[PDB]
Amino acid sequence: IKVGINGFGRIGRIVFRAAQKRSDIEIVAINDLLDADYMAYMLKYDSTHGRFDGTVEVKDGHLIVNGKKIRVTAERGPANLKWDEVGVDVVAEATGLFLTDETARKHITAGAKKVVMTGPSKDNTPMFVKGANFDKYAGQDIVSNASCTTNCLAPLAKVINDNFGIIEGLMTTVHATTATQKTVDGPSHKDWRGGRGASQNIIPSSTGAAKAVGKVLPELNGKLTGMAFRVPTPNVSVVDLTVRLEKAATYEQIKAAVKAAAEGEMKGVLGYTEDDVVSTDFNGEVCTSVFDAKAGIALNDNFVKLVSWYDNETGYSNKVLDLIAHISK
Ligand SMILES: [Ag+]
Incomplete structure (x- = not known):
């Protein structure tokens, strides 16, 4: 499952670190208003969780985390992300700016299949919490993790x-x-x-x-x-x-x-x-x-x-x- 992360904040960086410990989810693209050299710094060092377990370099304007290339962008508009080029299935929406079905659907237009908001939805987008209602998922394209x-x-x-x-x-x-x-x-x-x-x-x-x-x-x-x-x-x-x-x-x-x-x-x-x-x-x-x-x-x-x-x-x-x-x- 190729996953692209939008918003490399606190939640965006911890989702990245947790994905390195999983085998079924692979981060392939990150978008934030930061250059690649800065993104490598906010991943390598963390005041709360210590140094990153693995390697991280910058080459050709892109990250090389654990020997895997990751596309870096700084598109302010979610529709100009072109998730088709890197092949993202699910987009981790971790900006806090697009918490509605109208604004989060720009990733579907940009070439993604599904979108998961890393925050409580501001509209009628269904929220799913593990152990509570993960069985009530009916194949929606945009969900929320509350x-x-x-x-x-x-x-x-x-x-x-x-x-x-x-x-x-x-x-x-x-x-x-x-x-x-x-x-x-x-x-x-x-x-x-x-x-x-x-x-x-x-x-x-x-x-x-x-x-x-x-x-x-x-x-x-x-x-x-x-x-x-x-x-x-x-x-x-x-x-x-x-x-x-x-x-x-x-x-x-x-x-x-x-x-x-x-x-x-x-x-x-x-x-x-x-x-x-x-x-x-x-x-x-x-x-x-x-x-x-x-x-x-x-x-x-x-x-x-x-x-x-x-x-x-x-x-x-x-x-x-x-x-x-x-x-x-
Ligand atoms: Ag909290």
Whole structure:
């Protein structure tokens, strides 16, 4: 499966690094407003995930990563990309600028077969999260992988709902710093709080990742919404799911249910741990949701507080390839 990446940002670079560890997905073309010499630098060195495992050179204005040529372009218009020349099947849309079917279809016009958005769709484009609704894919040409927080809350909420039933849920993600925020109190027209100093503040932020669970899980629609807190960590976030259960269940029964799915139908997606883990213990975690058993707490048999870790970069990126590989079946 030849895959072309549009937008060599944080998600774009981690999708590239995760593809080097897979055999069914091969990156063949990258497009961003950067020269080839700069793209080789942002791949070779990474402050969060260390140096790149492999070789990377620049020749003829193109990258040579692990002895494989990769076409580099800087087309601002998605239709002028000419994916026919390099032969791309699925385009990884990782710019955040084209999150609609009208704007993402320019890759189909440019010579691609399918498009996967690395973000929550802004229109009626269907969103798919692994372990939640990957079976509901009906061969659409443009899909979406929702958000990274949705890829963490949906697999956990599905197991809790299928076992005990969620009447109403209220979540909160202690999120890490992203490239949206500022290092120092700067301007931010869309979000005033987001313009404050990231390394100095606990910045509240609104998110619709919990309300988006109702789209990938129609049985939980209108039963989930939440918020966020941006904290001065470079990577790895954690959600705080607070749900009211329909069936009475103890915490030891909740741990056994999450552990059964972690070792069963949701292996590789929903993780499970009983260790004294912290955030940096999940830097580079492939799982999109790791349930922290000792961190959670319950008030009674029908009101519990669940804790689940997730990497907002590595975990979501690996599930972008999993969505590319699923639509290609
Ligand atoms: Ag996130």
